Design an enzyme around this catalytic site. Structure first.
Site, mmCIF file in Angstrom:
data_model
loop_
_atom_site.group_PDB
_atom_site.id
_atom_site.type_symbol
_atom_site.label_atom_id
_atom_site.label_comp_id
_atom_site.label_asym_id
_atom_site.label_seq_id
_atom_site.Cartn_x
_atom_site.Cartn_y
_atom_site.Cartn_z
ATOM 1 N N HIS E 107 79.627 34.072 17.172
ATOM 2 C CA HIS E 107 80.267 33.045 16.377
ATOM 3 C C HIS E 107 80.582 31.901 17.319
ATOM 4 O O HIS E 107 80.549 32.060 18.533
ATOM 5 C CB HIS E 107 81.551 33.573 15.733
ATOM 6 C CG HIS E 107 81.315 34.516 14.592
ATOM 7 N ND1 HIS E 107 80.829 34.102 13.370
ATOM 8 C CD2 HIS E 107 81.492 35.853 14.489
ATOM 9 C CE1 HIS E 107 80.712 35.144 12.566
ATOM 10 N NE2 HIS E 107 81.108 36.220 13.221
ATOM 11 N N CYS E 155 77.533 29.280 15.443
ATOM 12 C CA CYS E 155 78.023 28.237 14.548
ATOM 13 C C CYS E 155 78.621 27.171 15.436
ATOM 14 O O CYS E 155 79.100 27.453 16.533
ATOM 15 C CB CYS E 155 79.116 28.768 13.615
ATOM 16 S SG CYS E 155 78.468 29.766 12.260
#
Lengths: 167, 4, 88, 88, 167, 4
Positions: E107, E155
């Site tokens: 992430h 991300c």
């Protein structure tokens, strides 16, 4: 002019080899290409960027010979730069352009470009992501699917960029 | 020469 | 009707130096990065796409001439080659 | 003796998306960026340099398939083409 | 293996067209290429990155077929990632390598990659410039003049990356 | 599909 011209023959050869992966070009008769040059030579609390006058003269002629209308702006503040950008993003000429060139020249730090009224204790810098932000599909749809080339002539800090090695 |  | 589009695309920055580092300038010769970008532009705009031309510029700064400098290409989202087809 | 060298050079990042934006992933298909980087790698490593291959990847994300994503190439200091000459 | 191999003939053709501007390749018999894959699937306060196992399997096989020894690391903290990097930068195999591949998967936010123990109120992220910093000529001279390709699957925020247009 |  001083730019080595592309011959029709080689142009089509290039156009042939990989046509599908080339940004389309707009007819020379109808397109109105725009380019913006922002240069800061005079500063209120930093040594004058002596030599800018030559860079300006240099880029301008180049862009023009590339087929771009060059709008030149000198000694602006971040604010003024942010304003001029919103203006340039709204120009009507882009609707009939196929790309655009933005050129910045001034002192700078790692985080961004220095505006005319910049000092150590009171900042005046234009964050790099802001330029990308103001010219994207949301804030400037006239340029969607069209080349947006930003060229920056600015220091990115104070380090001299070198290390020593033995030999 | 100077620093930009 | 309406369709979705990428918020950021077809960009390409080209800085005179790498992060944390300075760039050089001469009072009667201007910025090296600039004079060199131009030199290469005038030369290869006819046959090379912009990305390639930028690389060729970085390459001319490869051997540290005292006033060391290394041009960086950043935030590239060019999904295609961009030839400037000068002459038309 | 000693000579100077560039502190930063021959780098090249390739992110799955553009700044501020997310990237997609499937529980039984993994990341699209990845599966696609691989697909292209297997295909063009023999004839195209890394930079070109990366572009070709960005290009496959050009038409927004709902799960929109745009791969960015960053902090490039590659002064030369890098072909992986697979097979030797 | 699954990688489309480069034929001797075309290899020399490529080698001929622009030899002077190609990163030199080291003989297959003597080089020891290294590659590092850092993947974070398990997190203490964020939804598990289901599917990572397939990405790992994917990249590893690829790199190996490209001629790289792949060192895989799972679920690390920024600290651990910063440590593993210093380790990888010091590996002796690089002295006899011609390039390197670093691959991160986890992430992330706009400023950096997320480590295993990351939360909204207590950060655990690896700033992107740090990776570039630890592998440069100063902190890793073994790789001077050699390709350092970083690949990141993460991300960069929360925005969905799209805007609407009329048609 | 999820967000990375």
């Amino acid at each position: 002019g001083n730019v080595k011209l592309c011959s029709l023959e080689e142009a089509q050869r290039i156009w042939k080899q990989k046509s599908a992966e080339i940004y389309p070009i707009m007819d020379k008769s109808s397109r109105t290409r725009l380019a913006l040059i922002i240069c800061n030579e005079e500063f209120d609390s930093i040594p004058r960027r002596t030599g800018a006058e030559v860079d300006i003269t240099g880029m301008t002629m180049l862009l023009q010979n590339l087929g771009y209308s060059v709008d030149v702006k000198k000694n602006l503040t971040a604010s003024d730069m942010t304003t001029e950008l919103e203006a340039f993003a709204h120009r009507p000429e882009h609707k009939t352009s196929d790309s655009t060139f933005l050129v910045f020249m001034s002192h700078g730090i790692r985080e961004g470009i220095c505006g005319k009224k910049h000092s150590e204790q009171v900042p005046d810098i234009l964050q790099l992501n802001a330029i990308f932000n103001m010219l994207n599909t949301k804030n400037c749809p006239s340029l969607k699917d069209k080349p947006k080339v930003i060229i920056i002539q600015a220091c990115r800090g104070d380090s001299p960029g070198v290390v020593w090695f033995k030999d | 020469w100077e620093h930009d | 009707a309406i369709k979705k589009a990428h918020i950021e695309k077809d960009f390409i920055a080209f800085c005179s130096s790498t992060p944390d580092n300075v760039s050089w300038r001469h009072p009667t010769m201007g910025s090296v990065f600039i004079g060199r970008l131009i030199e290469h532009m005038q030369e290869y705009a006819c046959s090379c796409d912009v990305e390639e031309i930028f690389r060729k510029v970085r390459f001319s700064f490869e051997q540290p001439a005292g006033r060391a400098q290394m041009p960086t290409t950043e935030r590239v989202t060019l999904t295609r080659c961009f030839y400037l087809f000068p002459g038309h």
